[PDB]
Amino acid sequence: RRSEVLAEESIVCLQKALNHLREIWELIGIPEDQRLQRTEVVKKHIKELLDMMIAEEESLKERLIKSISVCQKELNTLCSELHVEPFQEEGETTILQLEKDLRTQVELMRKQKKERKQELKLLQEQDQELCEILCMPSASVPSLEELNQFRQHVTTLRETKASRREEFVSIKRQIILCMEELDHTPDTSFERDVVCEDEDAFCLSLENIATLQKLLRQLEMQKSQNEAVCEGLRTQIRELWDRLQIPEEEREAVATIMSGSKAKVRKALQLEVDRLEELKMQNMKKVIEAIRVELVQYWDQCQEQRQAFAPFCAEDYTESLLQLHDAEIVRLKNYYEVHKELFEGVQKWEETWRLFLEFERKASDPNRFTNRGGNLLKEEKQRAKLQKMLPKLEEELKARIELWEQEHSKAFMVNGMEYVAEQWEMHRLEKE
Amino acid sequence: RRSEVLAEESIVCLQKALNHLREIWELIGIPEDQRLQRTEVVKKHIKELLDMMIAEEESLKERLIKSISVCQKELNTLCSELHVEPFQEEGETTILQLEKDLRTQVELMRKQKKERKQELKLLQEQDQELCEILCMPHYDIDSASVPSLEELNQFRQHVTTLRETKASRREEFVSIKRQIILCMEELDHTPDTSFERDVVCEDEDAFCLSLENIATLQKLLRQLEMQKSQNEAVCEGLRTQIRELWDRLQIPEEEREAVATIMSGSKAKVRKALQLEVDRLEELKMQNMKKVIEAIRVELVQYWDQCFYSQEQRQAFAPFCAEYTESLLQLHDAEIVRLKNYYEVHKELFEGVQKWEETWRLFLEFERKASDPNRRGGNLLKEEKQRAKLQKMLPKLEEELKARIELWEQEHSKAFMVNGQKFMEYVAEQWEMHRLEKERAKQER
């Protein structure tokens, strides 16, 4: 209602213009023909202009419809690449507005397509990283369900990753504890990257996990070994504590050696076992030697025969050789205990003969009246008493030797009564 | 009425186009605003084109009217400058044809002015050529910035008259030049001045035909005519002299015919010729009169010798030695006539006078032969006879002469003395010597 008014206005203007021109031509005076020519020129140019306008607007219409075709097809495809219903049913098919709608919706489809494709790439990247660390391994225009499922997959991978990382952390902690306990620094490459490196850069494959647990198994095996060896040494020490005096205070002093599995406590155990065993051993040598001293004591009271037994020679001193010498000394003491009343007479007789011979000697020296001790009758009478005891001693002890030979078969010797009677004969030949 | 039809037709065309665009709008879904603005632009360009064309045409019209006014003004200016009626036509009441015709008259009258100017300059360029030769102004009022038909006609007539008069005066120039050339050819007088050179030596087209110049030419002709009159006169005097000297002496018609054949006019060196002849005649005459005189002189002396013995008496003639005026000749005539008749009267007397001596010498010879020392020639007796005859003859003449002398001396004169005083003393002396011869002879005997 406004464009029509403008149009009629323009037409009116053209009318007034034509009137004015015709009036001018009339005034100047042009014989119709050239007026008709001029008007034909005017109508020509105006025709040109108007046809130009019309052609322009027509080509605009062509632009609009072609646009509509292209967008129609493209949207028809983008409703297939995705799963969205095509918008329509407004009721107003104003081609400007309709084209605007198509173009805009298409733009949106492009946008969400690019967004979903990009998201696909990103999820593929995350999946790549997770498949890379856990060691557990087209692509264009997806949907939405595929996306969700993929997201679920990724989340599961992340959760399992967290699990493996926690487990690895704990096992690494325990492993550090072990390697410290055993006084051990990382040597093997895997042990190095597990303990020294760590930092979660350590791969969390099933391979690495199994290897890890294996290493832990080895370590705990070692710790168990050490505790077993050491405790065994401890029981040996107990055995040494029951087979000896061992006052409480020394047990208390050792009580730190009954500790753990550490090499120093082990070496301590060894040291103590060695030292205690050697100690007891030295006690064996000692006591055995003492028994031998008692033996020497009783040998004189009772040479080849004494040499016959002697097994103590050499360094082997134990409870074995101990009981050997103990049994022997007991037997010997039991021998002399029964034959004391026989040997005492031998000693007494030897002494008697000795001082008798002495008194005989002092009674022969012609310078006894010049160089001697007082009381001549004392020495003489005492000597006579010795000469009285001597045969009766040889008599009273004569009925014992035969009895011994009756009990103990064979004969008895000493230092090689034969020698006794030989001594008597020596005396009888001395005064000759 | 058809232009309006095509106009409204084009209007319907615009309506159709606008409805077509409205249609095109309806075909699609287009708002009011953009269509309104586009229609507004259409209106803008339509108004633009219309205003443009209407501006061009309006301009053209107002320029046409302007040009009309200007051409009318200029037409009035040129109609005032020259003298032409402002022509037009009432039928053409239109603007276009009016303007066109106006500037047409403009260009035409401009051509008229230019033509008149060129004609003016032409007439001036002929005038300048002729007036210089005529040595006169002959300039009209003649404004070099203003022309006029009648004045142009007057100029034409003026120039043509100048041409006619030029041809006339030049004709006179040629005629007089010819006459002068002839008179000079006869008088033989090569131009000694510069003007004569300007006439005959400078030749044609260079003569300044001023009236004074022509007067000088006439003056030259009068000079040649003058000298011609002089020479004609001189030669007339000479002519008369020749006929005259002819008449004085003997004039033959044969020799006169010869001179006539030798005779000419008064041209060249005829004066030198005739003169030479005049004096020649004067010489001839001079000889003639002399010759006669010479002859007469002889005769005089002859008649002196036949009478006059005294040299003084002969010298008493006075002029005789003088040398030839008519007076001298006539004087000789009178003298000799006088002497001739004077002698003729005394003819017999002087004859006897000579006869006396003629007989005396002879007689003395006969007497000398009479002494006769030789005693010679033949005839002695005859000689004696004739001697006696002479002796008888002498006294007859002696007394005769003595009387004639006495008769003559008595009345006619006073005295006389032939060959000295006492004319007889010669006679008496001869008689004395003869008497001496006789005395000597008589003494010898």
Curated annotation (Swiss-Prot), chain A:
One GO process term, biological-process aspect: regulation of cytokinesis
Chief localisation class: nucleus
Molecular-function GO term, any one: kinesin binding
Span list, region Spectrin-fold: 333-432
Subcellular location: Nucleus; Cytoplasm; Cytoplasm, Cytoskeleton, Spindle pole; Midbody
Similarity comment: Belongs to the MAP65/ASE1 family.
Assembly, per entry: Homodimer. Interacts with the C-terminal Rho-GAP domain and the basic region of RACGAP1. The interaction with RACGAP1 inhibits its GAP activity towards CDC42 in vitro, which may be required for maintaining normal spindle morphology. Interacts (via N-terminus) with the C-terminus of CENPE (via C-terminus); the interaction occurs during late mitosis. Interacts (via N-terminus) with KIF4A (via C-terminus); the interaction is required for the progression of mitosis. Interacts (via N-terminus) with KIF23 (via C-terminus); the interaction occurs during late mitosis. Interacts with KIF14 and KIF20A.
Entry protein name: Protein regulator of cytokinesis 1
Organism: Homo sapiens (Human)
Gene behind this protein: PRC1
